[PDB]
Amino acid sequence: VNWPYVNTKLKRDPAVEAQIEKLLAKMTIEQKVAQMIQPEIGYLTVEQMRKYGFGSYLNGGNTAPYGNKRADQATWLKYADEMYLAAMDSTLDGIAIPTVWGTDAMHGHSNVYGATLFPHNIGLGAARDTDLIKRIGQATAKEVAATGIEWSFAPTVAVVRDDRWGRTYESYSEDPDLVKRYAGEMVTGIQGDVGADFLKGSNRIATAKHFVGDGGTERGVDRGNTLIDEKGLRDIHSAGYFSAINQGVQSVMASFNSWNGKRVHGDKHLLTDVLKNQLGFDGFVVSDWNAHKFVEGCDLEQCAQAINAGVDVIMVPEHFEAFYHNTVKQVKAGVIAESRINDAVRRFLRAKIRWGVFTKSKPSARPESQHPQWLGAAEHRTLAREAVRKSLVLLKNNESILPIKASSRILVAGKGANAINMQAGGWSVSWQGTDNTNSDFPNATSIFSGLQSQVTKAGGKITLSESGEYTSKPDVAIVVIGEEPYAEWFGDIELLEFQHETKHALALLKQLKADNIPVVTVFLSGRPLWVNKELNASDAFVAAWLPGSEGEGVADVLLTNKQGKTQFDFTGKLSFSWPKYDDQFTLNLNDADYDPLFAYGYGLTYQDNINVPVLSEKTSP
Ligand SMILES: [Ca+2]
Ligand code: NA
Structure with missing residues (x-):
């Protein structure tokens, strides 16, 4: 089965690539692995960020920073500054690579008190309005930026075939043609168009979710088994990714479901051969919330198979410290190749560096952080x-x-x-x-x-x-x-x-x-x-x-x-x-x-x- 090459617009920035290579050449295995691990704020301390220098961390949505349920912009930005500075402190871990904060953006900055809540996707699909979708992306980027967050998960490109699924409303349509029309619009709304304004200003890093087939599970069971031939996986369930990748989406999130009996998070054919080699996606793959624990042979604290399959950043909200130490030992044991961690870090740094983590100021001082009124x-x-x-x-x-x-x-x-x-x-x-x-x-x-x-x-x-x-x-x-x-x-x-x-x-x-x-x-x-x-x-x-x-x-x-x-x-x-x-x-x-x-x-x-x-x-x- 041949999949089309769809990364046809975004060209690499030689200056960015130069910086990545200089960084990689000097990083230790420990520093490389740290870039690939993502803790969640309900479990992470500033001291742990100083010690390890994790490449990113997650706003899981269950709590505001510092444990507040609701927090002023100044409080969000203070938290962002602390983590940013802890990551830029080269004491303990030996390098100064800025971290980034990420968040799910289901229908606006929807984890956050006071955010504008747009209609869920099913209704947006009914609207048949591509320009509207792009503007919603632009609004969402601003509301996310107003909380000091650089990275948002959207669009959701599921193509839902059985409405019994509890995530049906997260899908624009049962029709792949409609999802294809929309997905690229949301991506450019969030990240900016490919070109001079790409990832600039209030634009955020975007993640398109979820690769792949989560809208095709048998009986619509959540995280269930998608039984379909590869041509069907391509022509029905991947349509949103064609346009999202073509518009240069920086991140793709792997899916909880299985495909013909095998968990996607452990499937090298899908996450490497199809997504990276055939489709040509040049960005980074992030896993879903503890999704790695369900892969054969993996658990909450270890999953070489997911990494080897092509996951570049591991969403391990609670067990990140043990996951970190285990992964380092696995690289040293030779069961995760250094070339693999190098590629993961390249793809991830490609996003952070091009977005501007080295060139922008600390979160509270950025221009896009000076507009609290953007939120709502x-x-x-x-x-x-x-x-x-x-x-x-x-x-x-x-x-x-x-x-x-x-x-x-x-x-x-x-x-x-x-x-x-x-x-x-x-x-x-x-x-x-x-x-x-x-x-x-x-x-x-x-x-x-x-x-x-x-x-x-x-x-x-x-x-x-x-x-x-x-x-x-x-x-x-x-x-x-x-x-x-x-x-x-x-x-x-x-x-x-x-x-x-x-x-x-x-x-x-x-x-x-x-x-x-x-x-x-x-x-x-x-x-x-x-x-x-x-x-x-x-x-x-x-x-x-x-x-x-x-x-x-x-x-x-x-x-x-x-x-x-x-x-x-x-x-x-x-x-x-x-x-x-x-x-x-x-x-x-x-x-x-x-x-x-x-x-x-x-x-x-x-x-x-x-x-x-x-x-x-x-x-x-
Ligand atoms: Ca239907
Ligand atoms: Na550091």
Whole structure:
């Protein structure tokens, strides 16, 4: 199987390469290995950084620096300075190579309190807007820079084929063509375009995740087994990497899944022969969180096989010290070649040096560190609100009930009506999102709050009641319902029916319908789900995905302006096929037998006059 060479734009900088060779020539085995190890701040001390001079360290997201839950910019920058100076202290370890701080950036700088939260990828995919993606990358780079961090993990280029996976919402589309179109835009948004501005100023080092096939696991099991021939791995699951590598992405993260029974992190064919030799990726490979422990023969404290397979930087958040000493002994034992550690360090230094770790000042003194307002900037929330508007997909709008006159009397109901944690989903300040409350999102706007602001301005009347209680009978009920927030395997499911165990939202919808109140359903989810029953109980139904912090984007489209005219029409179109039956687990565009309820590319607008009939509510045995 032949893979195409896709590193066609980025040319090496001879000055940078000169510096790498001079450094390598004088470094000890110990110093080289230190560059390859990445501790996490929950476990790392400044003293350990001084002693070892690790090449990077991770903002894992579970705590702010110094243990704070929330921290001023000055506090982030103080922590960054301390680590930077400890690394530049050549005492103890014998060299002065600046370290860098890295962070995951799932939908903005989303581990961080106060960050703008953009819609998760599935909704961005619905938007079909490459320019939007690039601008989101640019905004994200600034918000990351505002915390003193040089390196962010984004884009996520999974191509998801089975929506049972709990990470489905992290994917732009089931369609590789769409992911390919997007991936390079996010990379250049973050890093800058190849050329004079490459990696300059507020631009960050980027990592494209995850290589490869994590969206193709059997039954959508998280970290499961991807059963597909190599041509399929190339043509379906690698499309995002073609454009990300072509745009010069500096880092690639290896994936937790297996391919035909073998863990990717231990697969030299994938991580070296395919990624580096055939595709031509010239940057560095980073592993995922303790992913090395799952490779055959490896454990938390040792994994020569992953290194030998082509991993260049090991994400070992807690066991880094023992991992360090073991790896050094393995190089000395000859079971990890010096040529291999040399190549790992070359690729990693290539990123740090070209970004400018030797030429820029300490973190707190850098120009991109002088703008605390970048974190959650008004301009970025305006961008996110645009993304929200464009992400919404109108599935049903019977008798053109939408858009609703802003001057009407409206009831807003449903568990998601005023719950920012549900609209944001997982990877939002916290991992699962379960414990988030509205106060964890300063300057965000709930869906109710957005509607209320516009209805009040238009002289209408609005009421919030999750359970649908009212005093004055409304002209219409907007009911906001959906999945609870989740991340990773917590979100893996076996059944496609929404709330199959309780049907709590359905009871609410039927209650309102029984009172002859017109119902507009706003559905929050990380994926299409089987919702025929809820659709039947709705006059209109909107797939809003996981819109993030800017909930007023929903009001912008659903409501008229004050004069009663349309302000924004729907523009979004499905990037994942919507199931007609509760057992349509792998429903994908181009499938031989393709029978979706609503196809890839479907999405109504106010210009349509289409009614959706009552649908079958039969479920499988
Ligand atoms: Ca699909
Ligand atoms: Na050092």
